[PDB]
Design an enzyme around this catalytic site. Structure first.
Site, PDB file in Angstrom:
ATOM      1  N   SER A   1      -2.184   5.097  -0.588  1.00 19.10           N
ATOM      2  CA  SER A   1      -1.990   4.427  -1.636  1.00 19.10           C
ATOM      3  C   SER A   1      -1.383   2.925  -1.156  1.00 19.10           C
ATOM      4  O   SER A   1      -1.414   2.785  -0.059  1.00 19.10           O
ATOM      5  CB  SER A   1      -0.980   4.963  -2.488  1.00 19.10           C
TER       6      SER A   1
ATOM      7  N   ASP B   1       1.408  -0.436  -2.395  1.00 20.43           N
ATOM      8  CA  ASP B   1       2.558  -0.936  -3.266  1.00 20.43           C
ATOM      9  C   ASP B   1       2.287  -2.345  -3.524  1.00 20.43           C
ATOM     10  O   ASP B   1       2.050  -3.148  -2.617  1.00 20.43           O
ATOM     11  CB  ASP B   1       3.935  -0.782  -2.348  1.00 20.43           C
TER      12      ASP B   1
ATOM     13  N   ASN C   1       3.730   1.874  -6.578  1.00 17.34           N
ATOM     14  CA  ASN C   1       2.841   2.426  -5.851  1.00 17.34           C
ATOM     15  C   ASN C   1       1.801   2.725  -6.576  1.00 17.34           C
ATOM     16  O   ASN C   1       1.965   3.246  -8.116  1.00 17.34           O
ATOM     17  CB  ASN C   1       3.576   3.582  -5.141  1.00 17.34           C
TER      18      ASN C   1
ATOM     19  N   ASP D   1      -0.247   7.303   2.997  1.00 16.76           N
ATOM     20  CA  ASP D   1      -1.078   8.223   2.308  1.00 16.76           C
ATOM     21  C   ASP D   1      -2.223   7.357   1.489  1.00 16.76           C
ATOM     22  O   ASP D   1      -3.176   8.057   0.943  1.00 16.76           O
ATOM     23  CB  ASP D   1      -0.189   9.034   1.351  1.00 16.76           C
TER      24      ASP D   1
ATOM     25  N   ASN E   1       0.415   2.116   2.110  1.00 17.66           N
ATOM     26  CA  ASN E   1       1.248   3.246   2.712  1.00 17.66           C
ATOM     27  C   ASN E   1       0.312   4.067   3.355  1.00 17.66           C
ATOM     28  O   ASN E   1      -1.107   4.166   3.338  1.00 17.66           O
ATOM     29  CB  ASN E   1       1.822   4.188   1.347  1.00 17.66           C
TER      30      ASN E   1
ATOM     31  N   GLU F   1      11.921  -5.049  -0.724  1.00 18.91           N
ATOM     32  CA  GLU F   1      10.595  -4.701  -1.208  1.00 18.91           C
ATOM     33  C   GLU F   1       9.634  -5.729  -0.692  1.00 18.91           C
ATOM     34  O   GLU F   1       8.440  -5.401  -0.369  1.00 18.91           O
ATOM     35  CB  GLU F   1      10.618  -4.027  -2.633  1.00 18.91           C
TER      36      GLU F   1
END
Ligand code: NA
Length: 129
Positions: A50, A52, A59, A48, A46, A35
């Site tokens: 959003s 992280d 998220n 969409d 991301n 990650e």
């Protein structure tokens, strides 16, 4: 902060992540490697819209507030910036909520794709825990 592998394993263990919801410490270290590369300051947008945040790429769609993710929730009741601290307490506390949400560590797509079913104990090898 960029953690050492054994350094992060010790911190996650101290914060009670070892065998949390049945996931051995190596699963958590492996997730953090893929990650964040063990970097608390890691951020990734991301598709969409959003973002992280932090060692476990938590998220903003569900878990933290960053004030730029429309229709999102803040289920860990934290600013997303708190997930970037050199102190992983907020990340671990929030991760405990995520992994308890029903799909276990499948919530971390990088865990599912890169750690799941692998020799995750290798990630704590040589560590004095
Ligand atoms: Na949010």
């Amino acid at each position: 902060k960029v953690f050492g592998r054994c350094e992060l394993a010790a911190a996650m263990k101290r914060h009670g992540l070892d065998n949390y919801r049945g996931y051995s410490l190596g699963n958590w270290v492996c997730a953090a490697k893929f990650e964040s590369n063990f970097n608390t300051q890691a951020t990734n947008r991301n598709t969409d819209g959003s973002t992280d945040y932090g060692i476990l790429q938590i998220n903003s769609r569900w878990w933290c507030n960053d004030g730029r993710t429309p229709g999102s929730r803040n289920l860990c009741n934290i600013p997303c910036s708190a997930l970037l601290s050199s102190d992983i307490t907020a990340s671990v506390n929030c991760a405990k909520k995520i992994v308890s949400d029903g799909n276990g560590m499948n919530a971390w797509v990088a865990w599912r794709n890169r750690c799941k079913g692998t020799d995750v104990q290798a990630w704590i090898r040589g560590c004095r825990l």
